Design an enzyme around this catalytic site. Structure first.
Site, PDB file in Angstrom:
ATOM      1  N   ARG A 291       0.809  -1.215   0.000  1.00 15.84           N
ATOM      2  CA  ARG A 291       0.000   0.000   0.000  1.00 15.84           C
ATOM      3  C   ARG A 291       0.845   1.268   0.000  1.00 15.84           C
ATOM      4  O   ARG A 291       0.331   2.337  -0.344  1.00 15.84           O
ATOM      5  CB  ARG A 291      -0.949   0.012   1.199  1.00 15.84           C
ATOM      6  CG  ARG A 291      -1.870  -1.192   1.288  1.00 15.84           C
ATOM      7  CD  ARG A 291      -2.799  -1.259   0.089  1.00 15.84           C
ATOM      8  NE  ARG A 291      -4.135  -1.708   0.461  1.00 15.84           N
ATOM      9  CZ  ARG A 291      -4.493  -2.978   0.583  1.00 15.84           C
ATOM     10  NH1 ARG A 291      -3.636  -3.961   0.361  1.00 15.84           N
ATOM     11  NH2 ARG A 291      -5.742  -3.270   0.934  1.00 15.84           N
TER      12      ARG A 291
ATOM     13  N   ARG B 197     -10.324  -9.992  -1.157  1.00 17.12           N
ATOM     14  CA  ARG B 197     -11.387 -10.209  -2.131  1.00 17.12           C
ATOM     15  C   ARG B 197     -12.078 -11.546  -1.897  1.00 17.12           C
ATOM     16  O   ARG B 197     -13.306 -11.610  -1.772  1.00 17.12           O
ATOM     17  CB  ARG B 197     -10.819 -10.132  -3.548  1.00 17.12           C
ATOM     18  CG  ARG B 197     -11.867  -9.934  -4.627  1.00 17.12           C
ATOM     19  CD  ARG B 197     -11.251 -10.022  -6.010  1.00 17.12           C
ATOM     20  NE  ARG B 197     -12.255 -10.249  -7.041  1.00 17.12           N
ATOM     21  CZ  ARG B 197     -11.978 -10.526  -8.307  1.00 17.12           C
ATOM     22  NH1 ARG B 197     -10.730 -10.617  -8.737  1.00 17.12           N
ATOM     23  NH2 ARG B 197     -12.976 -10.717  -9.164  1.00 17.12           N
TER      24      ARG B 197
ATOM     25  N   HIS C 171     -16.671 -25.410 -16.835  1.00 16.13           N
ATOM     26  CA  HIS C 171     -16.994 -23.985 -16.867  1.00 16.13           C
ATOM     27  C   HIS C 171     -16.724 -23.379 -18.245  1.00 16.13           C
ATOM     28  O   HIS C 171     -17.568 -22.667 -18.809  1.00 16.13           O
ATOM     29  CB  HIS C 171     -16.192 -23.276 -15.774  1.00 16.13           C
ATOM     30  CG  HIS C 171     -16.126 -21.789 -15.919  1.00 16.13           C
ATOM     31  ND1 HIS C 171     -17.117 -20.952 -15.459  1.00 16.13           N
ATOM     32  CD2 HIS C 171     -15.169 -20.987 -16.441  1.00 16.13           C
ATOM     33  CE1 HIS C 171     -16.784 -19.698 -15.708  1.00 16.13           C
ATOM     34  NE2 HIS C 171     -15.605 -19.692 -16.303  1.00 16.13           N
ATOM     35  N   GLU C 172     -15.550 -23.664 -18.810  1.00 21.29           N
ATOM     36  CA  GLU C 172     -15.203 -23.112 -20.115  1.00 21.29           C
ATOM     37  C   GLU C 172     -16.092 -23.678 -21.214  1.00 21.29           C
ATOM     38  O   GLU C 172     -16.476 -22.957 -22.143  1.00 21.29           O
ATOM     39  CB  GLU C 172     -13.729 -23.373 -20.422  1.00 21.29           C
ATOM     40  CG  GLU C 172     -12.769 -22.743 -19.428  1.00 21.29           C
ATOM     41  CD  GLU C 172     -12.847 -21.229 -19.411  1.00 21.29           C
ATOM     42  OE1 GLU C 172     -13.203 -20.635 -20.449  1.00 21.29           O
ATOM     43  OE2 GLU C 172     -12.552 -20.629 -18.356  1.00 21.29           O
TER      44      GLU C 172
ATOM     45  N   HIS D 144     -19.221 -21.795 -21.146  1.00 23.35           N
ATOM     46  CA  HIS D 144     -19.012 -20.564 -21.908  1.00 23.35           C
ATOM     47  C   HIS D 144     -19.188 -20.812 -23.403  1.00 23.35           C
ATOM     48  O   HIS D 144     -19.880 -20.059 -24.103  1.00 23.35           O
ATOM     49  CB  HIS D 144     -17.613 -20.004 -21.641  1.00 23.35           C
ATOM     50  CG  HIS D 144     -17.491 -19.237 -20.363  1.00 23.35           C
ATOM     51  ND1 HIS D 144     -18.535 -18.521 -19.819  1.00 23.35           N
ATOM     52  CD2 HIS D 144     -16.438 -19.059 -19.532  1.00 23.35           C
ATOM     53  CE1 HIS D 144     -18.131 -17.943 -18.703  1.00 23.35           C
ATOM     54  NE2 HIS D 144     -16.863 -18.254 -18.506  1.00 23.35           N
TER      55      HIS D 144
ATOM     56  N   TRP E  21     -13.082   5.430   2.680  1.00 22.67           N
ATOM     57  CA  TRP E  21     -12.782   4.079   2.210  1.00 22.67           C
ATOM     58  C   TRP E  21     -12.695   3.097   3.369  1.00 22.67           C
ATOM     59  O   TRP E  21     -13.262   1.999   3.312  1.00 22.67           O
ATOM     60  CB  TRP E  21     -11.481   4.077   1.408  1.00 22.67           C
ATOM     61  CG  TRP E  21     -10.952   2.703   1.120  1.00 22.67           C
ATOM     62  CD1 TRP E  21      -9.840   2.126   1.657  1.00 22.67           C
ATOM     63  CD2 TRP E  21     -11.517   1.732   0.231  1.00 22.67           C
ATOM     64  NE1 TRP E  21      -9.674   0.860   1.156  1.00 22.67           N
ATOM     65  CE2 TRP E  21     -10.690   0.593   0.278  1.00 22.67           C
ATOM     66  CE3 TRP E  21     -12.640   1.716  -0.601  1.00 22.67           C
ATOM     67  CZ2 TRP E  21     -10.951  -0.549  -0.475  1.00 22.67           C
ATOM     68  CZ3 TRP E  21     -12.897   0.582  -1.347  1.00 22.67           C
ATOM     69  CH2 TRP E  21     -12.057  -0.535  -1.279  1.00 22.67           C
TER      70      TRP E  21
ATOM     71  N   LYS F 242     -15.217   0.324   4.920  1.00 23.40           N
ATOM     72  CA  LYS F 242     -14.649  -1.005   5.133  1.00 23.40           C
ATOM     73  C   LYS F 242     -14.838  -1.473   6.569  1.00 23.40           C
ATOM     74  O   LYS F 242     -14.946  -2.677   6.819  1.00 23.40           O
ATOM     75  CB  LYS F 242     -13.164  -1.015   4.765  1.00 23.40           C
ATOM     76  CG  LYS F 242     -12.567  -2.412   4.655  1.00 23.40           C
ATOM     77  CD  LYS F 242     -11.276  -2.437   3.850  1.00 23.40           C
ATOM     78  CE  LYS F 242     -11.506  -2.592   2.364  1.00 23.40           C
ATOM     79  NZ  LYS F 242     -11.897  -3.980   2.000  1.00 23.40           N
TER      80      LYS F 242
ATOM     81  N   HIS G 196      -8.597  -4.595 -10.756  1.00 23.62           N
ATOM     82  CA  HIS G 196      -9.734  -4.165 -11.562  1.00 23.62           C
ATOM     83  C   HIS G 196      -9.955  -2.661 -11.495  1.00 23.62           C
ATOM     84  O   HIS G 196     -10.391  -2.059 -12.482  1.00 23.62           O
ATOM     85  CB  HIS G 196     -10.998  -4.898 -11.114  1.00 23.62           C
ATOM     86  CG  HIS G 196     -10.986  -6.361 -11.425  1.00 23.62           C
ATOM     87  ND1 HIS G 196     -10.390  -7.291 -10.603  1.00 23.62           N
ATOM     88  CD2 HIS G 196     -11.495  -7.053 -12.472  1.00 23.62           C
ATOM     89  CE1 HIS G 196     -10.533  -8.495 -11.128  1.00 23.62           C
ATOM     90  NE2 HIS G 196     -11.200  -8.378 -12.262  1.00 23.62           N
TER      91      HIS G 196
HETATM   92 ZN   LIG Z   1     -13.392 -16.965 -16.780  1.00 24.96          ZN
END
Ligand SMILES: [Zn+2]
Ligand SMILES: *[C@@H]1O[C@H](CO)[C@@H](O[C@@H]2O[C@H](CO)[C@@H](O)[C@H](O)[C@H]2NC(C)=O)[C@H](O)[C@H]1NC(C)=O
Ligand SMILES: *[C@@H]1O[C@H](CO)[C@@H](O)[C@H](O)[C@H]1NC(C)=O
Ligand SMILES: *[C@@H]1O[C@H](CO)[C@@H](O)[C@H](O)[C@H]1NC(C)=O
Ligand SMILES: *[C@@H]1O[C@H](CO)[C@@H](O)[C@H](O)[C@H]1NC(C)=O
Ligand SMILES: *[C@@H]1O[C@H](CO)[C@@H](O)[C@H](O)[C@H]1NC(C)=O
Ligand SMILES: *[C@@H]1O[C@H](CO)[C@@H](O)[C@H](O)[C@H]1NC(C)=O
Ligand SMILES: *[C@@H]1O[C@H](CO)[C@@H](O)[C@H](O)[C@H]1NC(C)=O
EC number: 3.4.17.23
Lengths: 198, 596
Positions: B151, B255, B356-357, B360, B459, B463, B487
C-alpha cells in the site's frame, strides 16, 4: 454407352462460378446416365423436387440445365422453391413449380484457403428480387439512400457484391458448398436426352 | 425513403464487414496466444489496429442515423451499440492525457514491486511470489509488512494518477450524455423501449443495496465464525468484539477468503472430495475430461461440440518447443469457430474448469445465430454465471459417483456437506460485501459525495462497516488503498461479480426446479434433464436481442435480481453457523483498531 453426358465435367469441374454469376450448362442430346450422380459420395443434400431419383434414369426430357455455383453452408437451404434470403432473392431464385434436383456437397478442402479465398462473390444488395432462372451480373452502386449516388460508393451508396471469405477453420455452416441444380425442361419437342440403355 | 430502412441496409453491410474483420483479429490473437513468438505479436497488433480503425469508421458513420425515428427494437439496439462515442468525444489533448494516465497505471501495477530496506536484493512483484506471503504465511508481522509495503509503494504512487483519472473520466461521461462515469458503468444494465421490462441506470443502486441487507445475517455469522477461528491462530490480535484486521484474510485485498479454509475448517478429520487420485489412477487425459464435459452437456440436452473444436482447440500444453498462456479461456472466433485454450492436467480443478469453459462455449454457440452486435450476454453478468453453474452442478457427489471418479459406495455423512458449503462460502459469500462496498465507494467517488480530501477517510469507514474489515495502520491521504486492486485501476466494472454471484444461484435453483430435485440445493445435478437444458437454452440463444430482464424471466421466472436462492444454497451452513456461534458475539464494533 458412347454417348455419355458431360455431367462428369460439371460436377468434377476444378472452378465453380460465384452464386451471383452462376454457370448454366445446357445438356442437349446424349444419353443421360443419372445413376453416375455420385461423384462426391457424401453429398450434403441430394434432394429431388420432381421425379424420384429411382425413376430419374427412366424419363426422357428435351433439355437439361445444370446451374452450378458455390454458396455458404447455412445458405444451402435457400436453394429450394419458395425460399427467402440473400441467395434466393438477389443471387439465385428457384420457381415454386421447379421440376428437377438440387445436389449440394461440402467443398471445404477445395474452395478454402488459409489466408481467405476471396474469389467467390454474392450480391448483398439489389433493388428488387430476382425472377426465377434469371441472372444479374451488373456491378452498380446500390442507392440505399435518396440522394443520387453519382456512381460513387460512399454514405448510403453500397457496392452490391460482397466476397465469401472462405477459410478451412470455419464452421460447417460457413464452409464452402458446391451446388449443382439440374432443371429438366420437357417441352413440345422430341426428347433428346434419355436414360441408359440397360 | 425512410431512415429505418437505410439503417437496416447499413447494418446489413456492417454485419458482414465486421464479421470478416473480427474473425481475422480473433484468429491472429489465437495464433499469438498459443504460439508466443515475435511475428505473431506484429500480426496480432496489425489485426487489432485494423479492427479498431474499422470500428471507429463505422461508429462515425452510424451517427448520421438519429435513432429517434427508428421504431424497431433490434435495429435501434444495434445502432445504439454501434453509435457509442467513447473517448473520441473529448479534445485530442484530453484523450491523449487519459490514455497516458491509463497506460501508466496499468504498467505501474504490472511492474509493481516491493522494496526491502533491510536487503535491496529482496524485490518481489504481485506475481504469486508475493502471493504466498499473503496466502500461506502464519506470521502477523510479515503479513503486516507485505500489506503496508504494497500500500505504500504502489498505493501512494497512484494517488494523483487516480485523482486526474476521475476528472477526465467524469468529463468523458458528461460529454457522453451521462451524469457520471459511474452512470456510464451502470448503463450496462439499463433497458428502455420495451414496456414492463424497463430498468433504470440508478435502479441498480437501490437494488444492489436491497439485495445486500438480506446478505448481512449470513455474512455476519460467517464473519463471526471466521473471527472466532482466528484468536486461536492469532492470540490477542483479533479482539473478538472488534473487526478482522485487513492483512489477515488469506488474500492481498481480502477479495476472496479462500486461503482461510485451511485455518477455519469445520471438521479437520473429514476430508474433501478430491477425485484427482481416482482420475489419475483410471488413466484419464485432457481429451477424456472434455469428452465427459460434452457428455454432461448432451445429457442436459444441449448440442455436442463442433467437429472443428476438437481439431483446432489446444487442450494440452504444447510446451516442448513452444509457449502459450496458461489461462483457461473460451474463444468465439466467429463464423462457427469455437475453441478452448487451457493446459489441462489430471486434476479435479481442471475438470471443473473444463466444465466452466465448455459452458461458456455452449452459450457462445447458442447465441451465435444473432447479429454481430447482439452476440453477447444479455448483461455483463450472464457469461460467467452460466459458466459457473456448470461447475456448480459438476462437482456434486452424485455426478462424480455416476461418471465413476467417485466409486458407487461413497457415504455422504452430514459433516462433509458442512465442510463443502463453508469452503464454498469463504469464496462466494465472502466476496459479496467486498465487491458491493468497493463498487459503492467508487460510484460515490465518481459522482461526488466523496471529496478528494476524504478519499481515504470514507474508504476505511465503509470497510469498517459494510464488510467489517479494520485497517492495521492509520493510512493518511497520501495512500490510495482502493487503487491497488487490479480491476479498479484498469477501467473495469466490479459490480459484474456481484450480479454474477446472484444470477448463478438464481439459474441453479431454476434449473433444479426444472429437474425435479428433491433434497437440498447444494446436492443438485442437472444431468439427464432435457427440461432444464431446454429452459436454459431458451435464455442462452437470446443473446443481447432481448432485455436482460426478459432473459432472466426466461429461466428464473422473475425479472429482477433476487438473493433468496443464494440464501437457500447456504441454508444448512447458515443453520450450522447459527448453532455454532453460541457463546460468541455476532457482529462487530467499528470503534476498534489494532494500532490504537
Ligand atoms: Zn473466466
Ligand atoms: C445419466 O444417464 C447415464 C446413462 O443414461 C447414467 O450414467 C451411467 O451410464 C452407464 C452407461 O453404461 C451406466 O452404468 C448407468 O446408466 C449409469 N451409471 C450410474 C452409476 O448411474 C446416469 O443415470 C446419468 N449420468 C450422470 C448423472 O452422470
Ligand atoms: C475428377 O477430378 C479429379 C481431381 O479432383 C481427377 O482425378 C479427375 O479430373 C476426375 N476423376 C476421374 C475422372 O475419375
Ligand atoms: C508455431 O509454432 C511452431 C512450433 O511448433 C513453429 O512453426 C513456430 O514457432 C510457429 N509458427 C509460425 C509460422 O511462426
Ligand atoms: C425489426 O427488424 C427485424 C429485422 O428486419 C425484424 O425481424 C423484426 O420483425 C422487426 N420488428 C418487428 C416488431 O417487426
Ligand atoms: C456522440 O457524438 C455525436 C456528435 O455530434 C453526438 O451527436 C451524440 O449525441 C453523441 N452521443 C451518442 C451518439 O450517444
Ligand atoms: C454430435 O452429435 C451429432 C448428432 O446430432 C453427430 O454429428 C455426432 O453424434 C456428434 N459429433 C461430434 C463431432 O461429436
Ligand atoms: C448431523 O451433524 C451433527 C453435527 O454437525 C451430528 O451431531 C449428527 O449426528 C448428524 N446427523 C446424523 C449423522 O444423522
Amino acid at each position: 454407352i458412347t454417348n455419355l453426358c458431360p455431367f462428369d465435367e460439371v460436377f468434377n469441374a476444378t472452378r465453380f462460378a460465384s452464386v451471383y454469376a452462376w454457370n448454366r450448362k445446357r445438356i442437349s442430346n446424349c444419353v443421360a446416365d443419372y445413376s453416375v450422380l455420385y461423384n462426391f459420395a457424401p453429398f450434403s443434400a441430394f434432394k429431388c423436387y420432381g421425379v424420384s431419383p429411382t425413376k430419374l434414369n427412366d424419363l426422357c426430357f428435351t433439355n437439361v440445365y445444370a446451374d452450378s455455383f458455390v454458396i455458404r453452408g447455412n445458405e444451402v437451404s435457400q436453394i429450394a422453391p419458395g425460399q427467402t434470403g440473400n441467395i434466393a432473392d438477389y443471387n439465385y431464385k428457384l420457381p415454386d413449380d421447379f421440376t428437377g434436383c438440387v445436389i449440394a456437397w461440402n467443398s471445404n478442402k477445395l474452395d478454402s484457403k488459409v489466408g481467405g479465398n476471396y474469389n467467390y462473390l454474392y450480391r448483398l444488395f439489389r433493388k428488387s428480387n430476382l425472377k426465377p432462372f434469371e441472372r444479374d451480373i451488373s456491378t452498380e452502386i446500390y442507392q440505399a439512400g435518396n440522394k443520387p449516388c453519382n456512381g460513387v460508393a460512399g454514405f448510403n451508396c453500397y457496392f452490391p457484391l460482397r466476397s465469401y471469405g472462405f477459410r478451412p477453420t470455419y464452421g460447417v455452416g460457413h464452409q464452402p458448398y458446391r451446388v449443382v441444380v439440374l432443371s429438366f425442361e420437357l417441352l413440345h419437342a422430341p426428347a433428346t436426352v434419355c436414360g441408359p440403355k440397360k | 425513403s425512410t431512415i429505418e430502412e437505410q439503417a437496416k441496409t447499413f447494418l446489413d453491410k456492417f454485419n458482414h464487414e465486421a464479421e470478416d474483420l473480427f474473425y481475422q483479429s480473433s484468429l491472429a490473437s489465437w495464433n499469438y496466444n498459443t504460439n508466443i513468438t515475435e511475428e505473431n505479436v506484429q500480426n496480432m497488433n496489425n489485426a487489432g489496429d485494423k479492427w479498431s480503425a474499422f470500428l471507429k469508421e463505422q461508429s462515425t458513420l452510424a451517427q448520421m442515423y438519429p435513432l429517434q425515428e427508428i421504431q424497431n427494437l433490434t435495429v435501434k439496439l444495434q445502432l445504439q451499440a454501434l453509435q457509442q462515442n467513447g473517448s473520441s468525444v473529448l479534445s485530442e489533448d484530453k484523450s491523449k492525457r487519459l490514455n497516458t494516465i491509463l497506460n501508466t497505471m496499468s504498467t505501474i501495477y504490472s511492474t509493481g514491486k516491493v522494496c526491502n530496506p533491510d536487503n535491496p536484493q529482496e524485490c518481489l512483484l504481485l506475481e504469486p511470489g508475493l502471493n504466498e506471503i499473503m496466502a500461506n504465511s502464519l506470521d502477523y508481522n510479515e503479513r503486516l509488512w507485505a500489506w503496508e509495503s504494497w500500500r505504500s509503494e504502489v498505493g501512494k504512487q497512484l494517488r494523483p494518477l487516480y485523482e486526474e483519472y476521475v476528472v477526465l473520466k467524469n468529463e468523458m461521461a458528461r460529454a457522453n450524455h451521462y451524469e457520471d462515469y459511474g452512470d456510464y458503468w451502470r448503463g450496462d444494465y439499463e433497458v428502455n423501449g420495451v414496456d414492463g421490462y424497463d430498468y433504470s441506470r440508478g435502479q441498480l443502486i437501490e437494488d444492489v443495496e436491497h439485495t445486500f441487507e438480506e446478505i448481512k445475517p449470513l455474512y455476519e455469522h460467517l464473519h463471526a465464525y471466521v473471527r472466532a477461528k482466528l484468536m486461536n491462530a492469532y492470540p490477542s490480535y483479533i479482539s473478538p468484539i472488534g473487526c478482522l484486521p485487513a492483512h489477515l484474510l488469506g488474500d492481498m485485498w481480502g477479495r476472496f477468503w479462500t486461503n482461510l479454509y485451511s485455518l477455519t475448517v469445520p471438521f479437520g478429520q473429514k476430508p474433501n472430495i478430491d477425485v484427482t487420485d481416482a482420475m489419475v489412477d483410471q488413466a484419464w487425459d485432457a481429451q477424456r475430461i472434455f469428452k465427459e464435459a460434452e457428455k454432461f452437456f448432451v445429457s442436459v440436452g444441449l448440442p455436442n461440440m463442433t467437429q472443428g473444436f476438437w481439431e483446432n482447440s489446444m487442450l494440452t500444453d504444447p510446451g516442448n518447443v513452444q509457449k502459450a498462456v496458461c489461462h483457461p479461456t473460451a474463444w468465439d472466433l466467429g463464423k462457427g469457430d469455437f475453441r478452448i485454450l487451457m493446459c489441462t492436467k489430471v486434476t479435479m480443478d481442471d475438470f471443473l474448469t473444463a466444465h466452466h469453459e465448455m459452458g461458456h462455449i455452449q452459450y457462445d454457440m447458442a447465441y451465435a445465430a444473432q447479429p454481430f452486435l447482439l452476440r453477447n450476454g444479455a448483461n455483463e453478468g450472464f457469461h460467467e454465471a452460466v459458466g459457473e453453474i456448470m461447475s456448480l452442478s459438476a462437482a456434486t457427489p452424485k455426478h462424480l459417483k455416476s461418471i465413476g471418479l467417485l466409486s458407487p459406495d461413497f457415504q455422504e455423512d452430514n459433516e462433509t456437506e458442512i465442510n463443502f458449503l463453508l469452503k464454498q462460502a469463504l469464496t462466494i459469500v465472502g466476496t459479496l460485501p467486498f465487491t458491493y462496498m468497493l463498487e459503492k465507494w467508487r460510484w460515490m467517488v465518481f459522482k461526488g459525495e466523496i471529496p478528494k480530501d476524504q478519499w481515504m477517510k470514507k474508504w476505511w469507514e465503509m470497510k469498517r462497516e459494510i464488510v467489517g474489515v479494520v485497517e492495521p495502520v492509520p493510512h493518511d491521504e497520501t495512500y490510495c488503498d482502493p487503487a491497488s486492486l487490479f480491476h479498479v485501476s484498469n477501467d473495469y466494472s466490479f459490480i459484474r461479480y456481484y450480479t454474477r454471484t446472484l444470477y448463478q444461484f438464481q439459474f441453479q435453483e431454476a434449473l433444479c426446479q426444472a429437474a425435479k430435485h428433491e433434497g437440498p440445493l447444494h446436492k443438485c445435478d442437472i444431468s439427464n434433464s432435457t427440461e432444464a437444458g431446454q429452459k436454459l437454452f431458451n435464455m442462452l440463444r437470446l443473446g443481447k436481442s432481448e432485455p436482460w430482464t426478459l432473459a432472466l424471466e426466461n429461466v428464473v421466472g422473475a425479472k429482477n435480481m433476487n438473493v433468496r436462492p443464494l440464501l437457500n444454497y447456504f441454508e444448512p451452513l447458515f443453520t450450522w453457523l447459527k448453532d455454532q456461534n453460541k457463546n460468541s458475539f455476532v457482529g462487530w464494533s467499528t470503534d476498534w483498531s489494532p494500532y490504537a
